[PDB]
Each structure stands twice: as C-alpha cells, then as structure tokens.
Design a protein around this motif. Structure first.
Motif: not given
Lengths: 77, 77
Positions: B32, B36-37, B49-57
């Motif tokens: 997910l 999603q990220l 709306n979901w945005m990542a680089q590092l982590g999932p918290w």
C-alpha cells in the motif's frame, strides 16, 4: 470448530472470533479514513494528504478485502 | 495456545499462526505504502495524494500497532 488441520475457539467458537475480528477491522478502517481525510501531513522525507466531501473509497475497500480474505483462510481452516 | 474461554490450534500452533499474521500484515502495509507513495489519486468527491523519498511512517505505525493489538488480544485470549 476445526477445518483441517486448524481448530479455533473463543467459545461458542469459530464464528464468534472471526465476526469480532471482522468488526474491529471495519471500525479501524472507518476511523483511520475519518482522521486521514481531515489530515494533511509531512514528517521527515515523507508527505501525505487526504481531502474529501464524503466516500472513503481506496484504502477501505483494499483492507476490507484483505481481512475478508484472511477470514476465508481462517474458515477454510 | 489457550487463554480463557479461548483455544487456537493450527498444528503445530502457537507462535506459527501469530508469526504468519504479523508477516502478511506487514507485507500488505508495505505494498500500500510503495504504490500509494508514488500515487496521487482522485475518485468521486474523495482525493488522496502521497509522496515519498525515505520512510513510510504514519500509515506504517498505526498498521503495526493494529498487528500488535490483535497479537495482544490473542495472547490474552
């Protein structure tokens, strides 16, 4: 009861655990969406936004499938 | 194991059913989180709306507590 080789009771047994687990999940979905849909959030390199009028569609259907599929597994058991 | 009125057997049971539930829930949450990220998604009046680089918290932490919460219920029951 047992379907085999797995037997599960909190007792009167199999229906009652599984029915309780089904409800507890469904409740967790609804709450987690409700606060989320209020929510816009960033921590460290992770950033997450949800905004609504009403209909908590994507997460709730996916998790409800996942728990129900575990329930079908638990009852095959 | 049994704590009671509950007894849960898949056989051999105890650590094994529980370990399997921690593992599948963890995997589900990761799936997910990655898809999603990358995602930004709108359907009906509801948009996430979901945005990542590092982590999932935040999603990660609440889900992990839910795994735990069932685990505690089982340990207890």
């Amino acid at each position: 009861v047992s379907r085999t080789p797995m037997k599960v009771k909190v007792g009167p047994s199999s229906v009652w655990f599984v029915s309780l687990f089904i409800g507890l999940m469904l409740i967790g979905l609804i709450w987690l969406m409700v606060f989320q849909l209020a929510a816009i959030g960033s921590q460290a390199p992770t950033a997450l936004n949800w905004m609504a009028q009403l209909g908590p569609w994507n997460y709730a259907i996916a998790f409800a499938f996942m728990i129900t599929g575990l329930l079908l597994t638990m009852r095959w058991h």
